[PDB]
Each structure stands twice: as structure tokens, then as C-alpha cells.
Design a protein around this ligand. Structure first.
Ligand SMILES: NC(=O)c1ccc[n+]([C@@H]2O[C@H](COP(=O)([O-])OP(=O)(O)OC[C@H]3O[C@@H](n4cnc5c(N)ncnc54)[C@H](OP(=O)(O)O)[C@@H]3O)[C@@H](O)[C@H]2O)c1
Ligand SMILES: NC(=O)c1ccc[n+]([C@@H]2O[C@H](COP(=O)([O-])OP(=O)(O)OC[C@H]3O[C@@H](n4cnc5c(N)ncnc54)[C@H](OP(=O)(O)O)[C@@H]3O)[C@@H](O)[C@H]2O)c1
Ligand SMILES: NC(=O)c1ccc[n+]([C@@H]2O[C@H](COP(=O)([O-])OP(=O)(O)OC[C@H]3O[C@@H](n4cnc5c(N)ncnc54)[C@H](OP(=O)(O)O)[C@@H]3O)[C@@H](O)[C@H]2O)c1
Ligand SMILES: *SCCNC(=O)CCNC(=O)[C@H](O)C(C)(C)COP(*)(=O)O
Ligand SMILES: *SCCNC(=O)CCNC(=O)[C@H](O)C(C)(C)COP(*)(=O)O
Ligand SMILES: *SCCNC(=O)CCNC(=O)[C@H](O)C(C)(C)COP(*)(=O)O
Lengths: 583, 301, 75, 583
């Protein structure tokens, strides 16, 4: 396209001379002549870049651009361009920093508005007031996202590059997130209402650990070579190959905006897929900030797509769309059942569910009390109640029942309530207004049946959406609070007789759910026995809320199926081809 | 005549399966002990291999020479294979982040799910039963098999051999009948935790739908396909003709991985088809018990 | 590849470059090369897009019938 | 070779007619015409066998015979032979049975005498008298064994058959051993002096479990397909294949004649190797009986080879021989070092060692005493002392030291001593005379230094080689008995202060060896902490002597390297090829 000057032709002829030397036979280097089709090794690509850099002083050339421009005309044209030849933020000053939050959609590595410039407000639960407006996605926008994702997979650069190359980009993404860790943590505190000290450790911290972990797996996903029956006297050879499925449609909950995004997205990209994320409506801002960092990290455009909006509009369309092959979900049972039904009707697509549960926590007499009280509170009141593996029920032994509850009340009084940005704060405000309303009805319905309210169980006189840490005692199995999940800072305590292991297990296991469980004991025989009998995904022993990115995580009966985190996570996003030879 | 199952009978089967899992001997014994019983089952099937092969020829209409190799043969190989796995299903010990200065230890355990409800197609009565049942029992589960209505007799003969092999009572349960009556109930039943299926797409979609509504149970599908077969000029023709016919006409057409389409190159197109017609004329048609027979009668009317 | 299904496929060729190239591009579960109808109990078996999901036969067949508990200690 | 009659030609022409029908094109069937080269499938082999069985009434034909005789003349000749066409034992009547023991060498599936008909006597330690004479191997005999093994591997049937076929033969071997389990157990009682009730459970029992376990692995040894860097724009494919090494030369100890043979041989044959076993001179009879059963099981001739004789003559030659590629060994450090030295000088062959150790056993106060006494004795006095993972030292806490020792002495008095065939017997006679002599010197040297002899420590007044169960107390770390291994029924007890975990670990770990260890405690924190700090291969918690064929087994520092049993065992006997393509 671009016309050459007198000096540029002298450079072009010097490049033409190099091509003759580098390539083996090469009768004549015309414009049509391709570099690799002639017969160029991977060593020859390095020799080319170095030889061109000797001619032109500077010229920041790399091996990647050689693979792009294979032909001679394409190479020279590209080389001439090197020689001769904005994101709308919302500013806000808090926590000795100046935040810059994107508020638009993200389709094909570009921040763009929705159809008709439709928007919705996002709330700050600390004060109660609005922070900014965010773009509301439509059905037309979903079509563009899935189209962009499919192009990035098939024809795009993401598919072409090596497994080791994909891993480097995912590791570089984590380093960018590490630099903006204080910035992301502050946005969580405004958006979700999470405490700042906790947000660095849990919300932002694990997110960084997730992308670093699954980056390592990229070039360690091996198939097999099977010793099958040889058709004597002829020979046979069978082997397996793990491949990507294609496009994926993730839908995340509101309890952990950034962390739940990371858990699913990191594993999906590691396998080698393109993604269309759908964040929660209450908390979209963390996801849009993450989309900004993918450009800096240097992810190809189209790979990551984000559409903030309503679940019934956007989420339902992804299920119905035939191009999408995989639906990740973490939320409630009723909503989860609807996705699996839509998955079957659409195009028999794959699905993995992660539903809520009513996790028990047995506490025997032989265990030390001071640690049991600490970890007892840390099960219930971790992340202002909102935790998917929160202690639903606490079974305490008769001998240490009265002593246990007395110590809990003392510590609950000491707990600080205030602004989450302040370092002195322990307990923070609830995520959104609609959630707070149900927690009031929960505690009201608890007292009706006849559960002894020790402390709390009502809203705090304060501007915002704060709630008092609550404790219930003398709770039977038949009650509503025993069965139904609170999903808030409410401790539910129960009694069981001395020296009765089999009976308490029957009460604990008597539930349709089974996500997590716990037990505190010094005796080794109890610990190992109880761990076997407890029908749950994740059992804890003398601890609680101790997950790892390496360790797998998932439910049993009515807490979904499949696994997040660990090696098992990758198996969901991969598919196995089986090649067979005969010779 | 064969007994037609009802809704009342399904309840008894699932009840018997649950008792065998929880309170029964199947759960209590070791993994190595379960593997021995599954290996002993295969040796019993090997003794009655000529008997099972003859029943296939009457019931399904399969050729006798093929039935020994494929239908009955692979069934024996299946139970021998998955018997070995029983005491080789290992978890892991994960190097997680230690809460310094305190220590931590994480480990995984692979366990059975519980009761399973298998539904098999009619193309391979005994083989498709073996593929799913063997793997299910190897993990350490109790099963409620539902055979095809057209071909129930192979499954009922298999149930006789479990008593001889010495499988605890309640583990294996078989209910010959209609798919809409029996198959639909297994999906709806809350005690069942897993539904194996191999058949058509329309029918397969209905099970996954019912699985979601019931009790978010697990499911694995194996549906039909239209498999291509490309044939280039550079390949040797005589072998290509043999394996070309052997893709299509294997097991009298009825094969889930049958060659749907054959793409042949222009240079050897006319030559290929000419050789196929010659060999198709030579193919014998008759009674499947006769050894001379190559092609047999279709499964049902 | 223009089909909603994808359970199995095949190819006959002497040239090694074609065999390995075609095997990659064919969107199917089980690819055969200079053979057909050659399954094994050890080798896995299953579909891709609209031929179901999961696997029968092999080590992968056990995973669907098993469930993973995760025990965690502190000391 | 064989001439045809008038009726045989009518059969031959009927077979000729079948070949025309079965094979696709086949212009004319002549004597030279091969079955498979024409283009015969695996289905066609079944059609042939059935069609021939229709003609001839009876005729027990199988598919294996068709693979042997591929040509038409070879098939017809073989078929005509089917239509038309001793082991020297030593009888002995004991235990309501009539034993039949081979006493010769075993080279190429044939019992044969040695060069010059040289022999040596084998002793019965119960009585003291001789039972029979056994053939003494020479250097000439070793050459024949290795030659037979190499032919069986390369040109023999063992290599040609499938992995699944090898597994069936190994499983059939176990079923034959199960039928002759009472017979093998009785030979152990005469040869080794092992108790009959123990021999069924341990010696013969685990041997059967070993061959059943490794039979399953045969067709489950998978390689990999590695996602390597693609030389863009060209493609690449890498895969691994696990293969056999070749010939192996196993040398077993005398403590467990049949069990140690099974552990190594089963894993070696499972990988797909040929073996040359060398049993201990004191106990050869169990190995020679095992060789008889391989013929019944139907193992190809040349696979298993056995050469009873001296270690310095036979064992040294196997190391020097260049055809041998692998040396398995279990014994002492002195002898073990010599093999690894000879392995390097010969032809840099592979080696895995399993040497003796001085295993500690810590006993805290919090543990229950009655169980600790049972498992305390069961560590030391299991299999009449002779156990490679025997408790070398017992560290007991001060609070329960006096109480523990008092209970041990009471139970040691109750222990029965007599003939091993008698069911009432608990403790049996020592393996051989030379072993008994060292155990007397051991206890004599113990009293010299100043160790309080509680009971025992001398020979029993009885015909045979019996020895009294011994107990030592007040033993320091500097003493000889503390450091050196007894390898006999001698309990060594020591003291350590209350509430001192770090100190007792320093004393326990202070040793060059590290094969096994143990700890008894109710407290879970101690159990998990002590298990980490104990420098040993196999740690037991509230148990002892609990090995499994699935669980791996091997030493650390100066107890050899590599593993026996489990999946890790196979890796030693296999080698990894790495094929790489470009397209
Ligand atoms: O637990 P849950 O909270 O009720 O829902 C979890 C997530 O799923 C979305 N959702 C709700 N209904 C849905 C549907 N029918 N299909 C797909 N996604 C849905 C929600 O989006 P919204 O929070 O935007 O409804 C939310 O982000
Ligand atoms: O050949 P197909 O049609 O692919 O069906 C395969 C198998 O599924 C059964 N089936 C048919 N409809 C069903 C339903 N709605 N739910 C569960 N199973 C069903 C059939 O039983 P039947 O052959 O007994 O209908 C058959 O054995
Ligand atoms: O009890 P040990 O002494 O630990 O020896 C263990 C085994 O190795 C043999 N052995 C002894 N010296 C050897 C050498 N130099 N090379 C190879 N093997 C040897 C012994 O055979 P012998 O018991 O026949 O010496 C014995 O069966
Ligand atoms: S929906 C699942 C929610 N996730 C969690 O509960 C996991 C959060 N826990 C952690 O990140 C760490 O275990 C904490 C408690 C923050 C710190 O542990 P520390 O021992 O390193
Ligand atoms: S629904 C899947 C149906 N199964 C099959 O098509 C597999 C049947 N094939 C075989 O049993 C062998 O592959 C045969 C055809 C007998 C060839 O074996 P030979 O080469 O030892
Ligand atoms: S040189 C290695 C020595 N091996 C052993 O000590 C292993 C022998 N132990 C066993 O066979 C079982 O562990 C016994 C002692 C019989 C207990 O089994 P039980 O608890 O089923």
C-alpha cells in the first residue's frame, strides 16, 4: 500500500540479500515468496530479526511480527510502518488514592455503550448514596459478545499461539493485578461493602493466587497412550488429546464479586477457551476494572467479554444461544435448576453447578475451648455473614454448652462496627438493601417458633445497611432456622448428650444439602471417624474457612456437581479426542 | 412371554438397592474383595459364553461367529478390566499454603455416589449393559438396570449368573418393560443419584430435563451421530474396500459408530464403487446360527 | 465437519502429513487412521457437541460414578 | 512332513473352500498363501475356527493355534496332528497331606540337574535333621538361564502376546497358588520354620494378593501426550511409551522365602520382563515349588528361571553378565554396597536396594495401655523376631514405664513354644543354626555394657533351634544394642521425660538407617507432628506391621532407594521412549 522512497529501496535490497543467505535453496526472492513455505526453521526467525536490527538503528522488532507477515511484500510493508510511522473513567478520591472505574460494556477489547444508552444505578451500602451509573446490557449486545468470542477462538491469535505462551499472558495478568491490588480492594469496599483488611487477604489476594496457579497448568495438561489389544500379527497405536470446548458463559454471584470471577475465568482461559462473563447487578464495578487490566496485560481482543445487567435477560439468552457450549454457575438451587433445564433443551450443552448449603459444626468437650470459640465465631461472622461455606448449625456438647455461649457473648460485644475503609473496623455493612430485609424476617420468624435470642437480631441505628451479630440457642431440628439458610451473621447453637457420636451424626447428616462441615476434637479416633460419616464435600478438623486454589471444592447431593479449583476444575472445560492408528 | 414391570415394582427395586448399599455387605467389604467378585463374575460368563451367544442370536438376531467375538467377548473383557481398577482408585495429598507458624494437611478421598439407574439401547443388549454396569459396580455402587423391551432375555440370563458368582442380594436389579413407564420413574425418584443413558437425542434431552427438576442428579449421555470417512487416492484400494464395507455393514448395519458418509477422491471413485458391488454380491444372507452366514436379520419389525 | 453430531470419524492415507493434519481438524470423539471399528475397554469413548458428554470405558469412566470428599486438618 | 490319506484330502479341500469365502479377493489358495498377508481381520480368525469345528466332530481348536500357523500348509499339517495324533519329587507325609517337592534347577520350563550333579543339604529347624538334598548351581548353569531368558523375551511368545493376555496368565497363576495354599504353607513350616496359622495369613496369603494386584496393572500402564512448543506455522506431536527393560536378576533374603519372591517377581513380569531368580541357600524349597505351578498356570518356557546356590558364586555372575539389565536386591548394607559397585563396573545397569534398619517406636502416656502392650509385643515378636520392619527401640514415657514393662512380662510368660505345625503354638524356631549363634552373642554383649535383663536372653533346652523371647530395660543411646540390629525376638525399652516431644524425636532420628517407625497417642496434634519429624519410610500411628500391596514400601538414607509394592514399583522395571513428529 505504502510507496517506497530512494533510501527505503536500499534497505529493501539489503533485506532481500539476507533472505537469500538464510533460506537453503531459494532460486529468487519475489514479492509472492513466503518465508516458511521455502523451508525456514525457528532458528532462522531469530537470524532474520537480528540481521534487520543491524541495518536500522533502534527498530524494536520481535519474533511475533515475523509470524504475522510471512510474505516478502507483507514483511517490507510492515517494516516501513515501524521506521516512518481513551477510556471514559469516573474519578473518585478516597483512601489516599484517586480511583478510575470503567462504567460501560466490554465487547472485543473495547469499552462501548449499550443499545439506546440504557443505564442503572449502583449503590454504596456504607453511606447509602449512589456512586455512579452503569450500562445495562440488552439481547443485541449478547449477540455481539458471543460473535466476538467465537472469532477470537477460531480465527483469532488465542488459538494459534502455544500453551506455554498462553500461560505467560495469564501470569502477566496476575502481576498487573498485584500492582493495582490496593485500587481493586478499595472498589470492593465501596461496591460490595467488604472490609479493607479482609479484602487484601481474601477478595483481591486469592484472585491473584488463582491466576498464578492455573497459569502453571497451561503447559502441563497431558493425555495418554493406551496399551490396547493388538490385532495380531498387525500393530495398533492409540492416544488421547485434551482440547478446548470453545465458548463459555459464566454467571457469578454477589457474595464475592472478584474472587468467584477469578475461580472460573482463570481455569477456563488456562484450558484455552474464550469467555463471556455475566457479573451480578448489585456488584458490577470489580469486573469492569478487571477488563481494563486485560488490555495492559496484553490479552488478544475478543477473549474476555463482560456484560453487566439483569440475570433473567442476559443469563437466559446465553443458555439458549447454540454457539455457547459450557455454562458455569454459582448461586441458589431454584435458579440453578432452571439453567440445567435450559441447557438440555438448547443444544445438550455441559454444565457445572455450585449451590448453597446448611453446613454443620460439631464441638466435643475434649477439644480446647478458647480456640473453639475463636474458630466458632470465625465460621459464622466471616465476611459479614455472607459466605457460601458458613456454619449453618453448631452442635455443642452438654458439659461445655453453658461455658461456650458465655465466652461467645463476651467477644461479640468487643466486635467493632463502622466504615470498612477504617482499619479499626471488624464487622462491615451488608451487600445491598434487599438482602438486609430478609435477615430481619429470618430473626423475627426464629423467635416466633421459640429460639432463645441471646443478643442481636435487628438493624443497627446507623446510616447504611448494617446488622447486629446475632446468637440463637435452644434450637430444635424441626424449626425453620435449623433447615433454611440465613446467609448472614447469625449463629445457631444446639445441644447433644455426652458420649453420643452416632446420634449427633444422624442429626447433622439429616439435610438435603452437603457443601461443607466441621468438627473440633483432640481425640484422633473421633476426628477420623466423624470425617468419614459426615456427608459433605469439604470437612474441616480443628479449623474452618481454610480453602486453597490447589485443593478442590464442590457439593454432593443438592449442592450441585463438578468441582472448582485444583486439577479437577480443568476437566470440566476440556474434552478428550481419541486417535487410533493401524500399521 | 416376559414379565412387564410396573411403578410398584420400581419402588421395590430402588428400596432393595438402597438397603444393599447402606446396611448391606457390599459397602462393608474391602475394595480388593469387590474386585475378586467382579473377576469371578467374568469367569462364570466365560463358561456360559456359548449359551449367552445363542440367546443373542435368537433375541437380537446377531450372527453367532460375531456374537462370540463382539457381543459376549467384549462383555467378558469389560468386567475383567474394571475388576482391576477397584483397588487402584487413589485420591491425593495437596501441598496447600501453611498458616505459619501452624501446620496444615489436606487430602482427597474418592467415594461411591449411591444408587444408579442405567437405561440401555437395543443395538447391543449384553455389551452396553456390561460397559456401564461394570464401571458402576467397580466404583462401589448398587444398580437398577432397565433393558430394552425388544431385547430383555440377555439381561435376565446375566442376573442368574450373579447368584452363581456370589454377588450380595440387592446389588443388581433388572426391570424389563416400557421406557416411558419405568425410565421416567427412575429420573423422578429422589433416592437415585445417577442416570446412565445411551440412545437418541430427543429421548436423551428429556432425561437431562427430568434430572434437573427432580433432585439436581448427575447424568452422562451417549447419543447417535453421522460419522464421516474420507478416502484419498494415495491409500491402497484393496484394504480401503474391505474396511469401507466393514464400517457400514458391521453388525447388520446397527452400529452407533457406523460410517454415515464416505468421501472418495475423483481419481479412484469409479474404481472403488466397482469393487464394492462385486463383494456385496458375495455376502451370504440366512440363519444367524449357521456358520456360513455373514449378514443377519434386523433386530425388530 | 459440517454436522451438529460428532461421535466418530475415519481417514485412509499412506502420507503421514495428511493423517496427522486431518485427525486434528476432524471435529469428532474417536478418529481412526487406516482402520475402522477398533474400540478397546482401556481406550475412552464419547461424543462432542450433540452426541452427549462424559465417557464410557477407560479410567475416565470411573470419574462420573465417583465423588471427591476433601478433608483438611490443622495442628 | 506328514503324508495325507484319502479322507484327509476331502477335509483339506473343504478347508480350502472356506479360505476362498473368508478372504476378500484371494485369486488362488496355494501352500505358500498366508492368511493375514492376504488381508484377514480378527473377526475372520473366529469364522475359520468355527467352520473347521463344523466339519470335524470334537477337535479342540483355539484362536492361538491360528496365529502360530499362518500359511495353508502349516495350518493343514497342524490340523492333521490334532485329528490323528515327569518331575522327580521327594514324597513326605505330614499335616494330613502328601507333599511333593522339586529338588532340581529350573532352566527353560524344565527341571534338570546341575553340572557334575553337585548338591547340598537343607535343614529342618524344628527337629534339626535333614529333609532332602537340593541341586547346587554353577557358572555354566547361570549362562544357560540368562540365554533361555533372552530367547523368551526377544523371539518367544511372552513378548508377542497382548498386555491383557499377560495379565490373565498372572491372574491364573494366583488361582493355582490358592489351590495349593495349604501345601505351600506346610513347606514353609518345614523349610523356614514359620508358624502354620501365620504362614496362611502372611507368607502364602500376601503372595497370592501380590500376583492378583500386579495382574491388574498390566493393561493400565499408560504414557502421555505432551503439549510442546509448536514450530509455527508448522505443527508437532510428542508422545511417550512405557516399555520393558529386558532380562532381570532378582536376589531374595531368607526371612520371607515366598513373599519376597512374589513382591519383586510379580511387578517384574507385570511390566513384561523375563526373570532369573536366585533364592537363599538356607530356604530354596518354596521357590522350586513355585516353579512347578508356572507350568500348570501355563507360563511360556524361559520366562521364569530359578538357580538355588551360594550368593558369592551365582549372585556375583548375574551382576557381571552384560545381558542382564536390572538387579533387584533385599538384604544387608555390606552385601548391598557390593552389588551397586559391580553394577557400575559391568554395564551401568539399573539397581534398587532394600536394606535393614533400626526402627523406633515412641509410646506416650495419653495412649491407652492395653492396646499399646498388644501392638508393642506384635512389633517385636512378629514372625519369631525375623522381620525387616521390626521395632529396634521402644521409647516409653516415665509415667507409664513401670506399668508397661509389668504387663509385657505377664504376656511373654503366656506365649507358647513348640512345633510350628501345631495350632496351639505362637512362637516358632529360628530359621537356621548360624543365625541362632549370633542372637546368643547379642544378648551376652547387652548385659556386659549394663542393660537390665528382665527375662529370656538364652537358648531353650529343646531339640531344634528355639530361642526365648527377651526383654531389655534401662538402655542408653551410646550402647551397642541401641545402634546395632538384632534381627530376633528381643525387645529394647528406653525412658524419656514427661512433656518433651522435641528431645525424644532427636534421639529417635539419631540413626544412619530409616526404613520404618511408629507412634502411639490419642492426641491428634502429636500424631500429625511426630509423623512429619520422624525421618523414616513407613510411619505407623496406633498400629504396627500393617503393609499393603497397594501401599509403597522403601527406605530413605542407608536403607537403599526405590520402592517395592504399589504403582511406584513398576517405574523401576519400565523405561520411557519419547517419539516426536513434525507435519
Ligand atoms: O442465586 P441467585 O443470587 O438468585 O442468582 C445468582 C446469579 O444468577 C443470576 N440469575 C438469576 N436468575 C437467572 C436465570 N433464570 N438464568 C440465569 N441467571 C440467573 C443472577 O443475576 P441478577 O443478580 O442480575 O438477577 C445472579 O447474578
Ligand atoms: O431407542 P431410543 O428411542 O433411543 O431409546 C433408548 C432407550 O431409552 C428408553 N426410553 C424411551 N423413552 C424414554 C423416556 N422418556 N425416559 C427414559 N427412557 C426412555 C427406551 O426404552 P423402550 O425401548 O422400552 O421404549 C430405550 O431402551
Ligand atoms: O543375608 P545377606 O548377607 O543380607 O544377603 C542377602 C542375599 O544376598 C546373597 N549374597 C551374598 N553375598 C552376595 C554377593 N557378593 N553378591 C550377590 N549376592 C550375595 C545371599 O545369598 P546366600 O545366602 O546364598 O549367600 C542372600 O540370599
Ligand atoms: S464461596 C467460598 C468462599 N471462600 C472462602 O471461604 C475462602 C476464604 N478463606 C481464605 O482465603 C483463607 O483461608 C483466610 C481465612 C482468609 C486466611 O487463612 P490463613 O490461615 O492464611
Ligand atoms: S455402540 C459401539 C459399538 N461397538 C463397536 O463397534 C466395537 C466392536 N468392535 C470390536 O469388538 C473389535 O474392534 C472387532 C471389530 C472385533 C475387531 O477386533 P480385532 O481387530 O481384534
Ligand atoms: S520385610 C517386610 C515384612 N512384612 C510385613 O511385616 C508385613 C506382614 N503383615 C501382614 O501380612 C499384615 O499386616 C498382618 C500382620 C497379617 C495384619 O493384617 P490384618 O490387620 O488384616
Amino acid at each position: 500500500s505504502l510507496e517506497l522512497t530512494e533510501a527505503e529501496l536500499a534497505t529493501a535490497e539489503a533485506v532481500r540479500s539476507s533472505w537469500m543467505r538464510i533460506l537453503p535453496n531459494v532460486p529468487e526472492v519475489e514479492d509472492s515468496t513466503d518465508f516458511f513455505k521455502s523451508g525456514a526453521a525457528s532458528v532462522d526467525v531469530v537470524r532474520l530479526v537480528e540481521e534487520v536490527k543491524e541495518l536500522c538503528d533502534g527498530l524494536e522488532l520481535e519474533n511475533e511480527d515475523v509470524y504475522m507477515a510471512t510474505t516478502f511484500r507483507g514483511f517490507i510493508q510492515l517494516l516501513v510502518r515501524k521506521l516512518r510511522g481513551v477510556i471514559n473513567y469516573v474519578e473518585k478520591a478516597v483512601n489516599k488514592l484517586t480511583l478510575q472505574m470503567p462504567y460501560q460494556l466490554f465487547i472485543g477489547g473495547e469499552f462501548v455503550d449499550a443499545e439506546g444508552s440504557k443505564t442503572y444505578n449502583t449503590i454504596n451500602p456504607t453511606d447509602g448514596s449512589v456512586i455512579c451509573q452503569v450500562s445495562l446490557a440488552q439481547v443485541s449486545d449478547v449477540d455481539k459478545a458471543v460473535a466476538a468470542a467465537k472469532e477470537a477462538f477460531e480465527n483469532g491469535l488465542w488459538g494459534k499461539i502455544n500453551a506455554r505462551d498462553r500461560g505467560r499472558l495469564l501470569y502477566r495478568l496476575a502481576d498487573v493485578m498485584e500492582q493495582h491490588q490496593e485500587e481493586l480492594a478499595t472498589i470492593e469496599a465501596l461496591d460490595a461493602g467488604a472490609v479493607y483488611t479482609l479484602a487484601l487477604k481474601t477478595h483481591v489476594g486469592m484472585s491473584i493466587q488463582t491466576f498464578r496457579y492455573f497459569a502453571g497448568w497451561c503447559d502441563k495438561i497431558q493425555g495418554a497412550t493406551i496399551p490396547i489389544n493388538q490385532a495380531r500379527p498387525n500393530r495398533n497405536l492409540t492416544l488421547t488429546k485434551k482440547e478446548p470446548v470453545g465458548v463459555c458463559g459464566i454467571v457469578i454471584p454477589w457474595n464475592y464479586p472478584l474472587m468467584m470471577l477469578s475461580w472460573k475465568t482463570a481455569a477456563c482461559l488456562a484450558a484455552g477457551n474464550t469467555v463471556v462473563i455475566k457479573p451480578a447487578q448489585v456488584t458490577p464495578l470489580t469486573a469492569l476494572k478487571f477488563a481494563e487490566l486485560t488490555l495492559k496485560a496484553g490479552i488478544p481482543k475478543g477473549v474476555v467479554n463482560i456484560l453487566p445487567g439483569s440475570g433473567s435477560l442476559v443469563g437466559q439468552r446465553l443458555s439458549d444461544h447454540p454457539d455457547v457450549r459450557k455454562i458455569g454457575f454459582t448461586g441458589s438451587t431454584e435458579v440453578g435448576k432452571h439453567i440445567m433445564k435450559s441447557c438440555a433443551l438448547s443444544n445438550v450443552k455441559k454444565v457445572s453447578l455450585e449451590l448453597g448449603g446448611k453446613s454443620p459444626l460439631i464441638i466435643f468437650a475434649d477439644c480446647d475451648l478458647n480456640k473453639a470459640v475463636q474458630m466458632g465465631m470465625s465460621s459464622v461472622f466471616f465476611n459479614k455473614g455472607e459466605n457460601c461455606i458458613a456454619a449453618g448449625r453448631l452442635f455443642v456438647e452438654e458439659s461445655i454448652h453453658n461455658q461456650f455461649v458465655q465466652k461467645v457473648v463476651e467477644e461479640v460485644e468487643k466486635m467493632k462496627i463502622g466504615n470498612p475503609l477504617e482499619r479499626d473496623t471488624n464487622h462491615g455493612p451488608q451487600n445491598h438493601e434487599a438482602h438486609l430485609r430478609k435477615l430481619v424476617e429470618y430473626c423475627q420468624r426464629g423467635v416466633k417458633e421459640g429460639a432463645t435470642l441471646v443478643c442481636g437480631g435487628n438493624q443497627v441505628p446507623r446510616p447504611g445497611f448494617f446488622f447486629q451479630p446475632t446468637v440463637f440457642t435452644d434450637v430444635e431440628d424441626h424449626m425453620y432456622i435449623a433447615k433454611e439458610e440465613s446467609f448472614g451473621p447469625i449463629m445457631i447453637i444446639s445441644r447433644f448428650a455426652d458420649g453420643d457420636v452416632d446420634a449427633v451424626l444422624s442429626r447433622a447428616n439429616a439435610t438435603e444439602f452437603g457443601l461443607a462441615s466441621g468438627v473440633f476434637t483432640r481425640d484422633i479416633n473421633k476426628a477420623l471417624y466423624v470425617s468419614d460419616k459426615l456427608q459433605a464435600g469439604t470437612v474441616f478438623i480443628n479449623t474452618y474457612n481454610k480453602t486453597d486454589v490447589a485443593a478442590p471444592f464442590g457439593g454432593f447431593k443438592q449442592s450441585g456437581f463438578g468441582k472448582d479449583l485444583g486439577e479437577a476444575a480443568l476437566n470440566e472445560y476440556l474434552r478428550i479426542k481419541t486417535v487410533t492408528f493401524e500399521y
